[PDB]
């Protein structure tokens, strides 16, 4: 109740922090993935 701790010297420290910001933008085509080059599959896909 009558003792304190006061520092007499100091230091300067540099710390690194890595943070993500963005990710890859992906585009997906329903044609040439589901049916490929197939007109028979492409005819049935028009209802979706």
């Amino acid at each position: 109740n009558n003792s304190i701790a006061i520092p007499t010297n100091f230091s300067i420290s540099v710390t690194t922090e890595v943070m993500p910001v963005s990710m890859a933008k992906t585009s997906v085509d329903c044609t040439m993935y589901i049916c490929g080059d197939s007109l028979e599959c492409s005819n049935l896909l028009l209802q979706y």
Binding site: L39, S42, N43, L46
Partner: protein, 45 residues
């Protein structure tokens, strides 16, 4: 009142059509040859 799209036999837009001449009112060899039906024909006269 719908926006319907379909796959069928159609005449393509901005396509080139052959011109044939017809009009005894027949001055410049007006005649008709045998043409090709194919899978569908558009006839405008």
């Amino acid at each position: 009142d719908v926006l319907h799209l379909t796959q069928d036999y159609f005449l393509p837009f901005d396509s080139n059509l052959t011109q044939y001449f017809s009009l005894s009112d027949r001055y410049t060899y007006f005649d008709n040859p045998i043409l090709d039906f194919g899978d569908g024909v558009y006839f405008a006269a």
